[PDB]
Amino acid sequence: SRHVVICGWSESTLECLRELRGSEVFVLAEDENVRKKVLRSGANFVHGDPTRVSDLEKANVRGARAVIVDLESDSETIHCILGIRKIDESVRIIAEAERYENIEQLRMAGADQVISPFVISGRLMSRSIDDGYEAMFVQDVLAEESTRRMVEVPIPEGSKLEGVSVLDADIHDVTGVIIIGVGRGDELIIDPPRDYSFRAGDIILGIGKPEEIERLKNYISA
Amino acid sequence: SRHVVICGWSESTLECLRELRGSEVFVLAEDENVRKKVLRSGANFVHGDPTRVSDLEKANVRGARAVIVDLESDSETIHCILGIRKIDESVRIIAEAERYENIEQLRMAGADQVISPFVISGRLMSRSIDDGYEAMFVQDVLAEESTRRMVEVPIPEGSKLEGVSVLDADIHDVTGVIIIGVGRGDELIIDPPRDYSFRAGDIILGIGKPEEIERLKNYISA
Amino acid sequence: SRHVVICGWSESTLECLRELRGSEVFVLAEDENVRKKVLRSGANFVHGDPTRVSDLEKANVRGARAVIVDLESDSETIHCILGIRKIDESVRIIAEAERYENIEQLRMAGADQVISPFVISGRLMSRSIDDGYEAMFVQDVLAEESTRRMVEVPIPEGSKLEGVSVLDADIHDVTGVIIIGVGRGDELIIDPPRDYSFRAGDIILGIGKPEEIERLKNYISA
Amino acid sequence: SRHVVICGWSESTLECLRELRGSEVFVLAEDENVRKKVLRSGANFVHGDPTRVSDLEKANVRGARAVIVDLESDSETIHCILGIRKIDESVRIIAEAERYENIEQLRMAGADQVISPFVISGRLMSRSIDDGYEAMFVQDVLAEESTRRMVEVPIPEGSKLEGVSVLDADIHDVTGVIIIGVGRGDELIIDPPRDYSFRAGDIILGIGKPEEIERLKNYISA
Amino acid sequence: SRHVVICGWSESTLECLRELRGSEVFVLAEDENVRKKVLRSGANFVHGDPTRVSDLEKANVRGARAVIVDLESDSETIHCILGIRKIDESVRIIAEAERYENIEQLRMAGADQVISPFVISGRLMSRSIDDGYEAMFVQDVLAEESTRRMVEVPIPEGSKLEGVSVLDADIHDVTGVIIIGVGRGDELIIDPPRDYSFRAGDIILGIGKPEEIERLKNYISA
Amino acid sequence: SRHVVICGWSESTLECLRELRGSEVFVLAEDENVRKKVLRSGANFVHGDPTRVSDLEKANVRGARAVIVDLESDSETIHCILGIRKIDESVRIIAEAERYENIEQLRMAGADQVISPFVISGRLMSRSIDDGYEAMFVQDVLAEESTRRMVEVPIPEGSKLEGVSVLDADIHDVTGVIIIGVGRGDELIIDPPRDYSFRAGDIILGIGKPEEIERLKNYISA
Amino acid sequence: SRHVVICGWSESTLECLRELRGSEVFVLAEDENVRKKVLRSGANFVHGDPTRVSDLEKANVRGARAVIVDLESDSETIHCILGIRKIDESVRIIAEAERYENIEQLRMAGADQVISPFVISGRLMSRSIDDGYEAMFVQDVLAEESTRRMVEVPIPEGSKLEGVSVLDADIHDVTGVIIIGVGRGDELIIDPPRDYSFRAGDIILGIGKPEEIERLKNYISA
Amino acid sequence: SRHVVICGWSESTLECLRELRGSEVFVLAEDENVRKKVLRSGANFVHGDPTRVSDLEKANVRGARAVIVDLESDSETIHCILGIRKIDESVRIIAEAERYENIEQLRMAGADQVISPFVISGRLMSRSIDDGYEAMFVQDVLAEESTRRMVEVPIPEGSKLEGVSVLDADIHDVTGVIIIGVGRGDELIIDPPRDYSFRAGDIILGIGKPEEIERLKNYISA
Ligand SMILES: [Ca+2]
Ligand SMILES: [Ca+2]
Ligand SMILES: [Ca+2]
Ligand SMILES: [Ca+2]
Ligand SMILES: [Ca+2]
Ligand SMILES: [Ca+2]
Ligand SMILES: [Ca+2]
Ligand SMILES: [Ca+2]
Ligand SMILES: [Ca+2]
Ligand SMILES: [Ca+2]
Ligand SMILES: [Ca+2]
Ligand SMILES: [Ca+2]
Ligand SMILES: [Ca+2]
Ligand SMILES: [Ca+2]
Ligand SMILES: [Ca+2]
Ligand SMILES: [Ca+2]
Ligand SMILES: [Ca+2]
Ligand SMILES: [Ca+2]
Ligand SMILES: [Ca+2]
Ligand SMILES: [Ca+2]
Ligand SMILES: [Ca+2]
Ligand SMILES: [Ca+2]
Ligand SMILES: [Ca+2]
Ligand SMILES: [Ca+2]
């Protein structure tokens, strides 16, 4: 599909660029000595300031499918999000919040999704005092080297599972996948109750082996 | 129980300290102008350099139950981990990796758990271009204010579940929690296959409402 | 009257503090080194971060009548205005833009008045190549030491000039105050044409001697 | 006429260059990595230090019609002004004062007009507490985007206004421009009193529509 | 007589302070960690910034008889000189030039004497390649511990020498001093030719033993 | 004749390099960005550290007729003088002392002549309080633009002036030059008494017009 | 045999290279402007950071026979040691401790020998207060310039000394070398007592003339 | 006994201060920040410049028995030694060289012992490629914790071994102390040949157990 713009260069954007091999990535960063490390990683570099609307227009924010924003501080992130929203009002913005109090301002400033790494890291370090399985789970289902994968499966138009409850479904027994949550629109219901009924076009979040994902996609086919 | 010693001060340790109200926390940091925000957060401050062994022993590393190491770089994190392993060989160390490739260095140095925030953040960025339910799941099951809580329930000795396989157990149909992982020792097996057999002392990693957690704890009793 | 909050300390906020002798001023800046010069200037210093919503609540932004924002860059200025609107949505915010591009972004973020000094100075330089009377007008009518003063005189409800046009009124002939503009709400009509009619509740932006202003105030009375 | 030399590159001299499109301008700056921004604005770059008299004469200060000085500090602005006054004692120098107390020293150094933005911006931020009509008047009549423009007209020799007082002339009543000041040489009388007689050579500073300005040039002709 | 004010502290003003024991010296410098060595040297310290006109008046510039200006750079030396000329127009200023080409800027700014150490020492080096008697002459007649002393003797009114030419005077044969220069006003004429005629008020610059100086003043008395 | 080495680059050596035009000069300095300003001034640049005995050997200290030493601090100057004296024990060393106490150590370390600018400039500023003719005399006879020059004339073998006293000589009357001092070997006698007798091979230090020096050299010829 | 990798460039590793002329050595250093000094010493330069495991394997650490680590701090030395222990767990690592308390942490990180110069130099400066014979012994037997050299000899299989005690052997009485220590594997017995029996494989550490060393190799032969 | 002066503070002078517990030590360094760590280490701090002859006289260099010089570079070390020899020409100076070239320059400047750590460490690294028993000898015999100690035992006048050779004496057989060197004045004879004869007043540089040294001391008595 279309290209992806990454505003700023840090460690989070480096791992995002490592997992975005194959698609087209434009990196818009300020320093000129990052050109070798961006161009080595398989993405074109655009020298400029990410808060200026002209340099955002240079790096082709308009036709992109999502713009990933991570600058050095949090105020520059809010500035770049406002600049992107003056350019385009439909492009997807993914931001990085450095402090916990700024997530509401980063959502009201226009970002579609705010990822706070330090709050995740703090809660994982607070939860690894007694026994450390939560951090192992979160760091293994997001790694593209394990046997289990956390994927989204979509409900097609006119599937076999339209309107039937999840207690009458038993997706885990016949497909072998773990259903951790269902998604409709911009809301997510983790561990749905027995009375939840599926709709057409839903997004089901599941963890399972790849052949179990194939049995799931063959199970909810039309 | 005993106390928790935090070496180094960053936003990760701040968000860890917000979740650790109710225990006794000794914070050890090189800067003295962070003393007011540590003492405001219900934690004790110890001035010193965490890389040095004497300034570590100022902050009671021996009688601690877990030490949380997040310093300014990765070299200081490795040096502080080795300084702690010089003091007590068996204390639990939870590190934090600033880059990706130093996770193996931090596990060779002596840390029992390496939590890399930037890798989780980058993979949650790259898995949120199309649809971002995964970021919502990861950031919502950790916060201890929502309706669903991910906990660890151990299998006690003399249970009704020892030797019984997971497909014979049917814990999701009875208790209401979702068995997303079984851990025994330091190994975590996500999505256990149906031929897996439980034992006494294994840890069940599940997500569920607190009523379902009480029902699960009443389900595995003797 | 109520107090005035000044966020950030720089050369613009210093010269505003001289013209605000007589009221109570809280100065909210990050560096401790400016505590001496503010307290000699007659304002209670509050050590805090102006971008933080907690430290803004210390400085009594809620009961204040105006908040003057001038921070070290325009990204931190936009961050501070969003923090104020998170606290109070009806307070008056006077900002300062550093570059020309950010004036539209600063007003959509919530500022009622954007006073950009580098646009005023950059256009007074290029209009002073030939002969400098534009800069001699602006820099003399604002200082409270010249013979003339540019003041704002309101029209009370029930005035003698309610509904009469500006040609039949003849303000400069009967009083001597030069009428350079009339304002209604958030609009200013520079050099109003002779078909414009007055209304009760209007403001008169005029230049004149103080005795001429006293001749204007009793003239527009009921 | 001749060219215009700009000593130093800052945000004030950047927006002096937008109003100086069409003329020939040399920018004398120390930093080498501003060379792209000067050339994109339509101005030649001369690399050198503006305080050195050799590097001034590289940028052709002898034949210029005005030199615009805005350096990083008030010390280097005064040092650069005396470097120009060693070259040519007849050229016109426009300088920018950072602080208020260095205005009178920049005039003794030889500058013909000192434009201090932080005293203008500081006085506009204090007059915009109650109602922001002063800052709207300044930032509109200088911008060449709105209708009314503040222009200067001279009185030529043998004019119809030569020897006439301002109460008999009634310039606003016939032409339609607002005469806010009339200046002889290097003085300016804002709101001229009724006993002021016009003389040949005085500069009338007026505000009006461009149709009203052309009527003023025909009203004062020979 | 009156006091001497020294602005700025360097190695030049330290050796000036050793030769000025017996008068009252007010040292004005920006650093406070030089307070011990000034008060040890028999001089009073005033903390402040010498470039500011208010912090000059702490150090009593008006009633002084000479101000000695040696700051950290050459731009600071000019901006301090112009502050003194704003305070008192007729006080004597002895500057010090760090470079060669800024000697003319310091005389335009208002200094009555520019003493460049790096030009004197830079010309004493290249004149000491072959034989260094010229470096020995300059450094020994200034030191007030040797046997020969270079002094200035003024010609009083009503002398026996007024109108008498130098070749008729024969001062070297009678007094023993060497008339190496005659100064009247601000001009110094080194090696006066034989047709030169003295006047009352002229200054005789001569070198001689302390016995020969007392004979010279008795030679030119009434 | 042979070449001259200048160890170090500062303001003193630049004024030494302006008067060494025509002769061969090697400059040995540490920074690589001074290569433009030395090669523009007419001398070859040798990149290296002046304290290393190898880098002194690169700049050809051995065959030079004098080596001029001026480094950044006084401690490096004693190091560079000791480094030269291990190489050659007959080459002429001219140093620059930054402080007054270091002059005695710089002579015992091996420099033939120590030039202290801050003691010269210190004693000129203390002597320019009353009247400034001492500083005007030193800065004109060392400048190669005046009418009078301070030169060194040698006594040839078998001159007319051999053995005769200076009272019987009357050099000032018949040659027109001012005799300020005589030099034999490494000693200098400023203002010799009447009983001083000339020897062959002396260096006489005199100030006079250029034709007055030619009358001097013709007078003391053989 | 194989090559030798040197991680980092300092004055210790500079003088490791003078003793390693003739072998093949790679120097891994971050700074680019040391490349000429490495190449002039007879060593290949590999540009890169020694803490990164990629930039180590560029410098061929897999096949080396020893790696010498001396980085700017003790933190980066421990981080670089664990970078080598991730590559090859069998290579020999020689490291330098800056401080004394970081010796035991460099041994836990994996270094086979920690050479701390500041503890050796600190103990020689305390033993040279009374008489400086300790510091003369160390700095002579290591230098390959004097006559006596401290070399190591192994005891091969089936030797004449195999099974003999040190009082019966009388090595100094027959060969002439001074046996100061004999070491088995990774231990060393300085001044071995009389009941020490030699075994096959022990390393005899002795001091003697090169004629005496060859007599020792014949005395212990098979 | 008398006191010890330590000029400059670094890691070498810290480890010397540990071995000097029991005497009085004055530490003369520039930075105020090391005042706390010296006073905890048991030495009276003196704030001063070690290169200055005035501040050396504060630290009682005259009555001292040894002055240990280790400053931040070798140029300041040579400067400080010349200052001590300007004060006292008979005091004992123990220096520290940073590079190999300066060891001859440091001893001609007046130092009695130059202990260069980077020459010792750089030659212990290259002798530890094969097997590290040289570094295990030096770093263990100097520490005052091992079983053996390298001490100096003098020969008193009138001893039993005055005039006997080293072969007829048989020191290692009758006592057990290994004789590694004998010293006379400023010379050390490592591995003395059998034709060397003893003298009264000699020093014995030996390695052995403390009971063996007590067996040596009563053996060489009169
Ligand atoms: Ca970031
Ligand atoms: Ca847990
Ligand atoms: Ca499964
Ligand atoms: Ca961190
Ligand atoms: Ca997704
Ligand atoms: Ca449930
Ligand atoms: Ca500002
Ligand atoms: Ca104009
Ligand atoms: Ca400026
Ligand atoms: Ca107002
Ligand atoms: Ca009009
Ligand atoms: Ca008027
Ligand atoms: Ca100076
Ligand atoms: Ca000469
Ligand atoms: Ca005389
Ligand atoms: Ca210098
Ligand atoms: Ca004088
Ligand atoms: Ca003459
Ligand atoms: Ca090192
Ligand atoms: Ca000793
Ligand atoms: Ca021997
Ligand atoms: Ca023994
Ligand atoms: Ca050192
Ligand atoms: Ca070896």
Side-chain angles (χ1 to χ4, degrees), chain F residues 87-88 90-102:
Chain F
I87 291 181
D88 195 306
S90 88
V91 68
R92 189 152 187 88
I93 306 181
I94 297 140
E96 189 174 63
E98 293 216 349
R99 295 177 279 191
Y100 178 67
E101 50 254 28
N102 305 321

Side-chain angles (χ1 to χ4, degrees), chain D residues 156 158-164 218-222:
Chain D
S159 180
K160 329 174 182 177
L161 258 65
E162 200 251 340
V164 184
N218 291 116
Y219 181 63
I220 66 169
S221 312

Side-chain angles (χ1 to χ4, degrees), chain C residues 172 176 209 212, chain D residues 191-193:
Chain C
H172 192 205
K209 293 154 181 291
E212 286 174 354
Chain D
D191 183 28

Side-chain angles (χ1 to χ4, degrees), chain A residues 13-25:
Chain A
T13 63
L14 195 148
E15 311 295 337
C16 200
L17 185 49
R18 264 187 190 174
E19 193 176 1
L20 273 190
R21 275 310 204 104
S23 198
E24 185 68 27
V25 171

Side-chain angles (χ1 to χ4, degrees), chain E residues 31 113 134-135 139 193 221:
Chain E
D31 185 74
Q113 190 75 58
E134 297 179 356
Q139 295 187 90
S221 158

